[PDB]
Design a protein around this ligand. Structure first.
Ligand code: HEM
Ligand code: HEM
Ligand code: HEM
Ligand code: HEM
Lengths: 146, 141, 141, 146
């Protein structure tokens, strides 16, 4: 899953441009907008009605940074990655009850948002360079599901 | 199952695109082939290099096809009917790949419409493809 | 698709089932829980253990809905549109579990009824479970 | 993957109690009858016209043995579920261009065949044993990805 710096650094470089925050609350709101059955386990969360509701929800915005801090914690530990999301995995299974497929579905929101922020700076060679890493996070939070 | 104010946004958002339409698909495809390599093997004959008359060649007709869809949402099966079995028994394309493309087409559209890529719009587009990709794959099973 | 043969097999094997469909609907549900412990989340009011009267009670419903559905093969939306709302809007079910349920739903018929469970039927069936799963998945996209 | 000592117990008697040849062939042929788009990797088996031929095709049959025999390799290697398929994750993605979702799909097909051939002896529990067993191989087959 690792890479020649050629693309493995583009990420480390490209994430440097972007706020690791306005992206999270951006990708999570979207997760809830495009897949609206996702608002289950969000009932301690309040008004999610309209995409404008969801977008302007300071819980979603609040949870944005957390999900990102973790995402960062991967970003540093790109090899470790299964034994570091160890704690959230049992938590995303045996107490939030998430279905393992939505990690990939969030990931995709992170990528769609990452080139929403970056337009052209972002390209297939760099786009997919992140994918490997998103798709590696989904497979790291879903190991304890069994 | 779409609508009713969904068609408005589809069209609305598909409105910005215009003449830029053809070019998008083309790069999305590149994204795919970068993001999901095995997708490439549906195009053994294409040259897949960053710039291609060959991918710009098929892409435009990708982009057309949807552009056609955006104008006939009351029945898209009926329109996409040509491409319908073409992908099913002639081409034998794996369903998992259509969602693969949508994702890449969406990563394309948001590089290019930063101020028009909004959650209502973004959703109305995920839908758009969903139905299309669904309508498309209706001739497998 | 849903063509001739499908209808033959889709209707012709849902009889071999006779009054057994509900214990089958029970058996399928129970299968899910063991293999997918997440599927247990949508059912926290139920007492999920093997012989449970709720699961049995609920199995009878998922028998009926389908048995009805396997009849009105020609309008699969509208027989099931009692149930789209509930799963799609009022239950916010996750689309992924129908993949899970219908799989379990089949394994059971395979195991209980091999002679009948021929690729062709197996095949006509999955083409039909998907059709149900489809409609149920309708109302949020 | 974790399988409780009780869990590898049932994996063992059932897979013993079960031929092990026609399962693969009955498993395989079902895949390309059920999901025909998957036959595109098999046009050298000639006639995959219909369910009949599909089932009655010596190369469908011969490969079927081939799959399980190595599907058995993993049953006797459970924890070590990686290197077995070291090559073979390779063919099925690099020389044969397979879509890794299809590993599950075959996985799920084997699960149904094990219960065709066992009927009442396939417990939801015994079933759940194999599901991890399937998932493990299926996951271990689509791992080559850099
Ligand atoms: C894909 C990357 C994801 C990461 C890195 C992640 C990480 C996290 C973290 C760090 C927390 C809270 C930890 C804390 O501050 O105590 C959390 C909680 C939570 N997660 Fe995620 N998650 C991800 C995906 C998802 C998805 C896809 C869903 C569901 C659609 C989800 C649902 C939840 C919910 C509902 C909570 C609430 C519990 C709380 O208030 O802390 N997560 N997650
Ligand atoms: C909404 C999505 C899609 C659209 C709009 C679309 C559009 C088209 C069109 C218009 C053609 C034939 C037109 C012509 O005469 O040039 C075609 C064929 C083809 N499509 Fe699809 N398609 C879609 C999905 C896919 C996907 C997901 C794949 C990935 C496997 C794919 C791969 C191909 C290939 C390999 C051909 C034949 C290549 C060639 O003509 O050289 N398409 N598609
Ligand atoms: C395609 C197969 C399915 C059919 C035909 C179906 C249909 C039904 C029916 C008929 C009912 C009961 C209505 C009544 O009580 O009169 C019901 C309730 C319910 N279903 Fe499903 N469903 C299916 C799959 C699923 C799946 C995969 C889940 C997710 C695990 C699910 C979750 C639920 C829940 C939580 C209820 C409410 C239980 C209750 O009544 O207390 N269903 N559905
Ligand atoms: C997940 C369990 C699987 C196992 C254990 C398995 C095993 C095998 C084996 C033993 C071979 C023969 C190659 C050799 O001699 O080394 C093979 C080849 C092949 N497999 Fe699989 N496979 C699996 C999944 C799949 C899937 C999902 C597909 C999708 C279509 C597939 C399609 C093929 C094809 C087309 C070949 C080339 C064989 C030929 O010459 O016709 N296999 N696999």
């Amino acid at each position: 899953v690792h890479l020649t710096d050629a693309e493995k650094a583009a990420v480390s470089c490209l994430w440097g441009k972007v706020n690791s925050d306005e992206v999270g609350g951006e990708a999570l709101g979207r997760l809830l907008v495009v897949y609206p059955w996702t608002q289950r386990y969000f009932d301690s969360f309040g008004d999610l009605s309209s995409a404008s509701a969801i977008m302007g929800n300071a819980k979603v915005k609040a949870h944005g940074k957390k999900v990102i801090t973790a995402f960062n914690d991967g970003l540093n530990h790109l090899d470790s990655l299964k034994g570091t999301f160890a704690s959230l995995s049992e938590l995303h299974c045996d107490k939030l009850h998430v279905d393992p497929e939505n990690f990939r579905l969030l990931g995709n929101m992170i990528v769609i948002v990452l080139g929403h922020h970056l337009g052209k700076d972002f390209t297939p060679a760099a786009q997919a360079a992140f994918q490997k890493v998103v798709a590696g996070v989904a497979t790291a939070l879903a190991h304890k599901y069994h | 199952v779409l609508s009713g104010e969904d068609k408005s946004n589809i069209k609305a958002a598909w409105g910005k695109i215009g003449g830029h339409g053809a070019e998008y698909g083309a790069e999305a495809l590149e994204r795919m082939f970068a993001s999901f390599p095995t997708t490439k093997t549906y195009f053994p004959h294409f040259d897949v290099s960053h710039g291609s008359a060959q991918v710009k060649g098929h892409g435009k007709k990708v982009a057309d096809a949807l552009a056609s869809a955006a104008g006939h949402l009351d029945d898209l099966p009926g329109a996409l009917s040509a491409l319908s079995d073409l992908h099913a028994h002639k081409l034998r394309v794996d369903p998992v790949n259509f969602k693969l493309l949508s994702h890449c087409l969406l990563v394309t559209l948001a590089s290019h419409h930063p101020a028009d890529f909004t959650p209502a719009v973004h959703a109305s587009l995920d839908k758009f493809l969903a139905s299309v990709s669904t309508v498309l794959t209706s001739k497998y099973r």
